[PDB]
Design a protein around this ligand. Structure first.
Ligand code: GNP
Lengths: 814, 35
């Protein structure tokens, strides 16, 4: 329990600060280990609550210990910031943000399960942020109590876990950092049980046996790990696991560290009441008061806590091995900074200079109980932030030259983020983690605060990171729509990996990284964010209505008056041309002459036809056209607007089942009008044109980039799944992993992410973006063909009659 | 650490896996931050 003054004083000696987090696969004990750290060294102040985001720890080392720290130290006190990290491990950007504000990591690995993919994923991301790792092989009690494992087997298991870890490290760690691998002999590996309160380092045992073996601990800790044997018969230390006679020698680690522990367990758990007092006396363990009466596990738990207190082992690795900000910002500056490496701000970052201009990185916005207010969480890399300070808020798109994302505003309050609570403070210098209140509106997710007009903006790991799983969301009670629209905004702001947008069909879409992620999101959206009954359903797939050939015969339709008639034919527009229209080469507003020269000279069109396009559709710019091919119609100019309008209507709502048309060309062959404009009016010709178009359409034989990264041996699953889903491989490139690119029909992608991990042993990672439209060859009017099934399902879903009206329904015989 | 510094709030196991979902699955789902 410290006062604000004590805290602030502790924060001045950044050489004695440690910003870190705990990396662990679900169920490996990340929580119980931090509870242990908090109970042993947690810090607390001597009615606004927040979600616990970080916890402060306090630790003191002995004068000798502090001498061993291979980095700038000022005194024997240390302040440790245990920063919370998300639990979603899909190589998400929310995780990268959290790691970005840390410099070291305590990696938890299970004794039995060893290193699992989740573990490798966060560690890999961590290494990408140049974070230094330290390991704790947890759940050791399971191997002794449940599995009855032997000493050499336990050893071997430990050694294999350590090797698996240094494979990931040696693979992803920047060579500039040197050897960031972990070594039990160097004290960067702890072993223990977070559930039971005991742990140790070789160092602690070396200290214990050094002054006893008549040898300095530097020599002792090298001998207490690996292939070091002490032959009691010769009284000598060797590196051979056998003696001259060839008899088996027990490894020093097993003989001096494990055996005492093994004997304590065996004696206490078997109630050997005449063997326990001696063993405890020899190890100098003292039971006091009611403890003298304990037996079994109760006695064990109590005896091991006294013999080798857990928190102590962990704090030792944290203080002695994890880096303090001064050391790290020196080699992290350039990555962290987008600007010039020679820039005044970059240098201030390298020096962790508190007197320079401000360079504060906003890691994320954290939920508070202050009625819908989110506090900004981040780290001061340069300068010092102060309450009521005028600063420059620069979003993700800000550039020193433009005024985009820029927001100048005073910072209302600077708060210490201590777990679920906050503590207003006046200032905070470079090198520290901190929370800012009042930045809510201007920043959502990451950002960059500066006090320099020149200041440039700041930058991200082997879980899914793409919003491939999506559903349509809608309120059960129409009147709730406002809360839903608002809830989505709240949801988006709180989750970096969540996506929401409005579909072409007018549905609110919410997409998540994986099925589970999407589920949490929908639960939170419905219960909190929007707090209203929501209805969830598939996303509806949009289709296009086109023609495969020219009208088998002239389409003829008359107006309601029966006085006007339009004669036309429909024909396919080439894909390259549709694409050209959709992408900007052929435009609705371009000069008809130059456009026609292009369509004719470059796309094979007849220049007269091109010069005579009357309009594009739908919406006046779609990839469908009306070309005038009439010769001597007197009042043509007067019906043009009606014809154009009817086309916008026809191409917007196709006759197959109401989807928009695409790649449809309509040629007006002839028009017969009544002499009097009365009764030639839009109300007469618009229906005629739309009716004729639908008829020409139906008479023209109507019809309606998935990138995967993964290991070689897994690629086979990709082809396996794709073939089961009308997929098609596009490219197989590459000494990282492989990347297979393929086309996957959208209506074959629901659940794809699941079938893929299942076929690749969870090693493949998909990515999908809409690429193109593809024409289904089957008959849209045949309820049993592939296209027809889709058409029948949409028709029923919209309450239309099942049978698709045929062309005869729009043809008016002469 | 709270034995050495009064200024550390202790958080117990159930204060960290405190969410109703976490309780329901018996795992951690959300990242927690402690000090
Ligand atoms: N025997 C024993 N059990 C322990 C020890 N540390 C933790 N446990 C037990 O192991 C189980 C899991 O611990 P927990 O901390 O929740 O694991 P986790 O790694 O945080 N979980 P998840 O991966 O879901 O986050 C608990 O029942 C806990 O009591 C230990 O030192 N010894």
């Amino acid at each position: 329990a410290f006062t604000v003054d004590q805290m602030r004083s502790l924060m001045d000696k950044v050489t004695n600060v440690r910003n870190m987090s705990v990396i662990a696969h679900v169920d490996h004990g990340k929580s119980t280990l931090t509870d242990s750290l908090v109970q042993r060294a947690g810090i607390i102040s001597a009615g606004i609550t927040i979600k616990s985001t970080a916890i402060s720890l306090y630790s003191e080392m002995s004068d000798e210990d502090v001498k061993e720290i291979k980095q700038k130290t000022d005194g024997n006190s240390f302040l440790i910031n245990l920063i919370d990290s998300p639990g979603h491990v899909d190589f998400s950007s929310e995780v990268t943000a959290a790691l970005r504000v840390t410099d070291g990591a305590l990696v938890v690995v299970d004794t039995i399960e060893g290193v699992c993919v989740q573990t490798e994923t966060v560690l890999r991301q961590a290494l990408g942020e140049r974070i230094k790792p330290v390991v704790v092989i947890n759940k050791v009690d399971r191997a002794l109590l449940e599995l009855q494992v032997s000493k050499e087997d336990l050893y071997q298991t430990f050694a294999r876990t350590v090797e698996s870890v240094n494979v990931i490290v040696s693979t992803y760690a920047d060579e500039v950092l040197g050897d960031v691998q972990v070594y039990p002999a160097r004290g960067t590996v702890a072993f223990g049980s977070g559930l039971h309160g005991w742990a140790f380092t070789i160092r602690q045992f070396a200290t214990r046996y050094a002054k006893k073996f008549g040898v300095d601990k530097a020599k002792m800790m090298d001998r207490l790990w690996g292939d070091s044997f002490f032959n009691p018969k010769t009284k000598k230390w060797t590196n051979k696991d056998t003696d001259a006679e060839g008899k088996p020698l027990e490894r020093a680690f097993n003989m001096f560290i494990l055996d005492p522990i093994f004997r304590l367990f065996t004696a206490i758990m078997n109630f050997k009441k005449d063997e326990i007092p001696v063993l405890l006396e020899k190890l100098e363990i003292v039971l006091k008061g009611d403890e003298k009466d304990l037996e079994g596990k109760a006695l064990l738990k109590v005896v091991m806590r006294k013999f080798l207190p857990a928190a102590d082992a962990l704090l030792e690795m944290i203080v002695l091995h994890l880096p303090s900000p001064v050391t790290a910002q020196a080699y992290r500056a350039e990555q962290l900074y987008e600007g010039p490496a020679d820039d005044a701000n970059c240098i201030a970052i390298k020096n962790c200079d508190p007197k320079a201009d401000l360079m504060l990185y906003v890691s994320k916005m954290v939920p508070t109980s202050d009625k819908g207010r989110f506090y900004a969480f981040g780290r001061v890399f340069a300068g010092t932030v102060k309450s009521g300070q005028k600063v420059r808020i620069q979003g993700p798109n800000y550039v020193p030259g433009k005024k985009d994302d820029l927001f100048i505003k005073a910072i209302q309050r600077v708060v210490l983020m201590m777990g679920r609570f906050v503590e207003p403070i006046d200032d905070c210098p470079a090198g520290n983690i901190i929370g800012l209140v009042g930045i809510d509106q201007f920043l959502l997710k990451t950002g960059t605060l500066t006090t320099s007009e020149t200041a440039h903006n700041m930058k991200v790991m082997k879980f899914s990171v793409s919003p491939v799983v999506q559903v349509a969301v809608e309120v059960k009670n129409a009147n709730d729509l406002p809360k839903l629209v608002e809830g989505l905004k709240r949801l988006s702001k709180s989750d970096p990996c969540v996506l929401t947008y409005m579909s072409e069909s007018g549905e609110h879409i919410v997409a998540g990284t994986g099925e589970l992620h999407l589920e949490i999101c929908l639960q939170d959206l419905e219960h909190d964010h929007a707090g209203v009954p929501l209805k969830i359903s598939p996303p509806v797939v949009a289709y296009r209505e086109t023609v495969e050939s020219e009208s088998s015969q002239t389409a003829l339709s008359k107006s309601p008056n029966k006085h006007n008639r339009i004669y036309l034919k429909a024909e396919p527009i080439d894909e390259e041309v549709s694409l050209a229209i959709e992408n900007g080469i052929i435009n609705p507003r371009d000069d008809f002459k130059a456009r026609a020269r292009i369509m004719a000279d470059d796309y094979g069109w007849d220049v007269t036809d091109a010069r005579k396009i009357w309009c594009f559709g739908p919406d006046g710019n779609g990839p469908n056209l009306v070309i005038d091919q009439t010769k001597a119609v007197q009042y043509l100019h007067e019906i043009k607007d009606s014809v154009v309008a009817a086309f916008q209507w026809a191409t917007k709502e196709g006759p197959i089942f109401g989807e928009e048309m695409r790649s449809v060309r309509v040629n007006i062959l002839d028009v017969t009008l009544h002499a009097d404009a009365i009764h030639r009016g839009g109300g007469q010709i618009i229906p005629t044109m739309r009716r004729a178009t639908y008829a020409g359409f139906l008479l023209a034989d109507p019809k309606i980039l998935v990138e995967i990264q993964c290991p070689e041996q897994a690629v086979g699953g990709i082809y396996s799944v794709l073939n089961k889903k009308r997929g098609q491989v596009v490219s197989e490139e590459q000494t990282p992993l492989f990347t297979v690119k393929a086309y996957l029909p959208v209506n074959e992608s629901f659940g794809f992410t699941g079938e893929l991990r299942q076929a690749t042993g969870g090693q493949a990672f998909p990515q999908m973006v809409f690429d193109h439209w593809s024409t289904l060859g089957s008959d849209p009017l045949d309820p049993t063909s592939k296209a027809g099934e889709i058409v029948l399902a949409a028709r029923k879903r919209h309450g239309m009659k099942e049978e698709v009206p045929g062309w005869q329904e729009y043809y008016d015989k002469l | 650490t709270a034995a050495e510094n009064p200024n550390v709030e202790v958080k117990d196991y159930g204060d960290i896996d405190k969410a109703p979902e976490e309780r329901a699955r018996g795992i951690t789902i959300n990242t927690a931050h402690v000090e």
